[PDB]
Paper text:
Heat-shock protein 90 (Hsp90) is a highly conserved ATP-dependent molecular chaperone. Hsp90 is a V-shaped homodimer, with each protomer consisting of three major domains: a C-terminal dimerization domain (CTD); a middle domain (MD), which has been linked to client binding; and an N-terminal ATPase domain (NTD). Most higher eukaryotic cells possess four Hsp90 homologs: two cytosolic isoforms, one of which is constitutively expressed while the other is induced by heat shock and stress (Hsp90β and Hsp90α, respectively), one localized to the endoplasmic reticulum (Grp94) and one localized to the mitochondria (TRAP1).
To directly test the ability of the hemi-hydrolyzed dimer to exit the closed state, a FRET experiment was designed to look at the kinetics of dimer opening after ATP hydrolysis starting from a synchronized closed state population. This is possible because TRAP1 accumulates in the closed state upon addition of ATP in absence of Mg2+, whereupon hydrolysis can be initiated by addition of excess MgCl2. To differentiate between these possibilities, we took advantage of the fact that our crystals grow overnight, allowing collection and freezing of crystals every 24 hr for a time-resolved experiment. Similar to the 3-day-old crystal, no significant conformational differences were observed and no Mg2+ ion density was present in the ATP-binding pocket. However, electron densities for the ATP molecules showed a monotonic progression from an ATP-ATP structure (one day old crystal) through an ATP-ADP intermediate (3-day-old crystal) to an ADP-ADP structure (53-day-old crystal), clearly demonstrating that hydrolysis is occurring in the crystal. Ramachandran statistics for the refined zTRAP1 1-day structure are 94.6% favored, 5% allowed, 0.3% outlier.
Numbering used by the authors:
A (entry chain A): 85 to 151, 154 to 239, 242 to 369, 376 to 566, 588 to 638, 653 to 717
B (entry chain B): 85 to 148, 153 to 200, 209 to 372, 377 to 388, 393 to 639, 652 to 717
Write the structure that this text describes.
């Protein structure tokens, strides 16, 4: 029932020829100047990047052959519609003008990197690699003019329109550096506006090492903090940087400055906002050699760590030809694993340095850990994230938190079972029929009140090589006569009316068998328990026959009071109208 | 004060020399095979699309009969991926010019329909990402041509030799490198085909078995698609098991080219996925926002011939068109959802009950006022001029308003019975205005961010009651003066209440606007006060001197003064609960139980 035509029937017949690969140049220029970048505004990023490379080469030459400042200069002409950019770097002679700008995929900045020592400072700051970034000017310009003056012993002019030809001629007088003039298109006249160009520079090239002037005014007044020593950075510097990199306006409660040299080069700073996120609403930016690649990174961090803010910079991460994506690499997948373990080991340290501060962190961002244990499919990671979880216990007072490592610490030496009971509040967990069995023979049980706590431990399955298993006055006849009267007035409200001695001050309480049904009600088969020794109960027994219309309101109120005290009713607005009627009839 | 270097000073000296742009071919192939495509798997997509182009060149050629299909074979033992199509094939000249030249595309000179995927001329070189050796056997059409074998290692050179036994078409054999042994697996290759090339207009065979290629339903007439076809297509693009309750098949040619299908799942949206969706295609090939954040519940596919692709075929090149395309789709979905309330209001009442949280998000998280009001047309409330259970909208509220009115009054309550008997509604019934009833949790937060609708201000009932104090309090009680406390008995009672509620209320005043309730708490910005408590204030207690509970409170302060204070604290708590401003209602049960005991003798 199969059908395939691929068969080994071909054989080499005769001799063969030899040819080299070619390249249609006229078509290739159009590819770079159109179908390469998702935005037209990219040309500003590349021309500034090519200028910074020219500035870095001159700085490196002045180390051994030391001899004006550096920095790059821009200018916009809103009338003629021209975008001009000029650096005062190394420049280019006539040979380097025809070789570099005239040949696609040729990058003199790449050959410069391969000739330097790997310890040289310019070896980790040159941006060029491929050799096509310059041709992004033809995407927004009908005519490109380049003036350059080399640092050796005449200036030249490089002019082209992007149609497969260019002209070179002498010029005078060209300043030491390289000047580029872009006669913008009609649909690209927005790039002659000082405001629009300023928006583009602050997006990609805001952290260039050298100063950047726009019509005579400096822009990039911001320094890359992820490149400095974590000790020489003050707290007010991180607070000022977090508001920029995260587009927020508060202070980062946690700050992680990670610097590693084992997988590639990691110069990253992570933040945790102090304000809790909500519905009425950036992420971690990806830089490479101080240039923005992705505003919201996708491959370097897991999904459950998207609440982190900051920036991750890598000098040797495989970049895409568009400089806005990353290549599929085993180095990037291992980078995500190292970062996941570092953030876990970092938040664990904050839980020991300040449990009070970590408890505030787990209340706001605790849902991300519960999301991580469920989403991931690696069991060793599910237990690494579980070390961050916090729960209340049955053998501990209310309001105090403990970890799964603390629970396994206090367990009996002859047992290896983690027992938990996920209930709404504590009044429903302490009065659980499945917990009362674990209160006699068995010992400790975890109380998980937070949302999505059940399926988190259900997807956790195993922790610390151990299983998590969900642990799931009035006479004797005067009460029964009152019981039979309460069941008839509460037919379709509760399913069982009991009498228990544990009440004293409260005339009633609400206990529920299954806690999964208690959450579905809060999205039910309650058990109303009555104290035959309370004042309101003995008044209810005496008013069920003397004033049945008055005892009907009291019964409905005692049930509602037990529902509120049990957390089942948090908005007692429906009872206000009936409660006011009870007070007036009780104050006659 | 300024520092500029650029000055018009350069002048051309001597004549110029003309040159031609050149290309470094050895490094061009290195860029394609390493730094062009972000994911290695796309080499299967490019080779399949090259076979679909060759088959389309034969489809157009057969109309001046042979099988037209694509075959894939995986050899995990020899580490070999083989693709063979029965298309036009290439002669010796085509093998050297089309394949041996970067950026050269024979699928461009073929011009003179819209079923050819080839464009740039570099897609064939995507095989070198995963293969050390590429063998290509091609046979031209019925013509004066023999068979040939195209061979290359991927480094600068290639060899072409004549071959026999070359079937009509083209066969490419990829000797996979050890880095990419995943592509010699049948399961892995089938994942790549169904991802990118699941809508190819030709059959695809993998190791002998025919792959279930689907049909591009977004490129066909809507009136030729049955409900059962939209069911099966929704279960694929959304990867679901249910069926869509709504189906929008929107096509357009102005101002943009749009060929899209949208679905609304009949399942309620999982609350775990809301805090934690529509594909994009082009020429039946998968491409990887397009819809606003509040429309993330919709599932489907959007196609547009006006969206340019990049070289790697994974990026959209017009962020302004994407922003314009997003607004056009938003207005269409708004009209589509508005037409669903007209045809079946009961079904839309279910959809608004399951997805209404998305429409409220799109109103709060939007800066444009007109977008706030366009989405607001989808909201549904109940009116005080309509029977219980009947839903209405802001549009229907605006038509009922008289010529003199200029505001839209609304009231938020848990259910209908509380809104009809709310103390804030009894004060509104003295007016002749219509009041909307909002029962959802985040309805008041939405109407505060909406602010106005159709130049009419949204005023909550609790706010309008506070404003009338600063105007003419020309209202009258529901009971005659014989049933109320006298002015001497009222001031004597008001002074005692200010002393027992010193630091809990700003001031206490009498109001003639209550009938059933003894008191109510009024705050100016009541809507924001309820939102701020979801983590004191300046509240105002307004008593009803005709209520039996207040008249008894005036007498209790002289017969049982401690019982009167416990009652006053309870009236304040009840007025705070009914206002939605109550904190934790559990610590008050103690005083309530103690108050009910002393009252019941
Ligand atoms: N402003 C400038 N001053 C001096 N040299 C320059 C300038 N701009 C470009 N060049 C030279 O021209 C060459 C062409 O660079 P091109 O922009 O084509 O690629 P790249 O910048 O090296 O790398 P990428 O293609 O990744 O941007 C570079 O190697 C560089 O040495
Ligand atoms: N299997 C095949 N049979 C016959 N002709 C082919 C085959 N594959 C490619 N060709 C021809 O050789 C040319 C080589 O094109 P190539 O695959 O390199 O890029 P492209 O598909 O034209 O461009 P892009 O992939 O960027 O759209 C094509 O134009 C096509 O006409």
């Amino acid at each position: 029932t199969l059908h395939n035509i691929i068969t080994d029937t071909e054989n080499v017949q005769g001799s063969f020829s030899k040819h080299e690969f070619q390249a249609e140049t006229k078509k290739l220029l159009d590819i770079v100047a159109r179908s390469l970048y998702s935005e037209k505004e990219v040309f500003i990023r590349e021309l500034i990047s090519n200028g910074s490379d020219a500035l870095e080469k001159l700085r490196h030459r002045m180390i051994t052959a030391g001899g004006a400042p550096m920095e790059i200069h821009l200018q916009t002409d809103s009338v003629k519609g021209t975008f001009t950019i000029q650096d005062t770097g190394v420049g280019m002679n006539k040979e380097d003008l025809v070789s570099n700008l005239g040949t696609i995929a040729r990058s003199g900045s790449k050959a410069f990197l391969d000739a330097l020592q790997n310890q040289a400072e310019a070896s980790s700051s040159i941006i060029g690699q491929f050799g096509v970034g310059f041709y992004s000017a033809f995407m927004v310009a009908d005519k490109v003019e380049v003036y350059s003056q080399s640092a050796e012993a005449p200036g030249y002019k490089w002019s082209s329109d992007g149609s497969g030809v260019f002209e070179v001629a002498e010029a005078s007088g060209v300043r030491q550096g390289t000047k580029i003039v872009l006669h913008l298109k009609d649909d690209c006249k927005e790039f002659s506006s000082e405001d629009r160009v300023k928006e583009v520079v602050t997006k990609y090239s805001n952290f260039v090492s050298f100063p950047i002037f726009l019509n005579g005014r400096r822009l990039n007044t911001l320094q890359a903090l992820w490149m400095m020593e974590p000790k020489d950075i003050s707290e007010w510097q991180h607070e000022e940087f977090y508001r920029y990199v995260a587009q927020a306006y508060d202070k980062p409660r946690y700050t992680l400055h990670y610097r590693a040299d084992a997988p590639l080069n990691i110069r990253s700073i992570f933040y945790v906002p102090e304000m809790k996120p909500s519905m009425f609403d950036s992420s971690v930016a990806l830089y490479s050699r101080k240039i923005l690649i992705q505003t919201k990174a996708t491959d370097i961090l897991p999904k459950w760590l998207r609440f982190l803010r900051g920036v991750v910079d890598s000098e040797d991460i495989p970049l895409n030809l568009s400089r806005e994506l990353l290549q599929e690499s085993a180095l990037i997948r291992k980078l995500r694993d190292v970062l996941q373990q570092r953030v876990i080991r970092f938040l664990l340290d904050q839980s020991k340095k300040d449990p009070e501060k970590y408890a505030r962190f787990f209340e706001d961002y605790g849902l991300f850990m519960r999301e991580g244990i469920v989403t991931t499919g690696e069991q060793s990671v599910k237990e690494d994230i579980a070390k961050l979880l916090r729960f209340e216990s049955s053998a501990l007072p209310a309001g105090q938190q403990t970890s799964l490592m603390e629970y396994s610490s206090r367990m009996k030496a002859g047992t290896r079972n983690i027992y938990y009971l996920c209930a709404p509040n504590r009044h429903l967990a302490e009065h659980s029929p499945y917990f009362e069995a674990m209160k006699q023979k068995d010992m400790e049980v975890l109380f998980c009140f937070e949302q999505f706590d059940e399926l988190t431990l259900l997807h956790l399955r195993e922790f610390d090589r151990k299983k998590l298993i969900s642990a799931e006055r009035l006479s004797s006849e005067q009460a029964e006569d009152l019981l039979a009267w309460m069941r008839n007035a509460l037919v379709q409200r509760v399913t069982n009316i009991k009498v228990t001695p544990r009440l004293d001050t409260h005339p009633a309480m609400i206990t529920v068998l299954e806690m999964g049904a208690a959450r579905h009600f809060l999205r039910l088969q309650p058990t109303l328990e009555i104290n035959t020794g309370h004042d309101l109960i003995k008044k209810l027994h005496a008013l069920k026959d003397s004033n049945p219309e008055l005892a009907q309101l009291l019964l409905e109120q005692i049930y509602d009071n037990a529902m509120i005290a049990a957390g089942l009713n948090e908005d007692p607005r429906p009872m206000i109208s009936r409660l006011n009627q009870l007070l007036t009839r009780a104050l006659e």
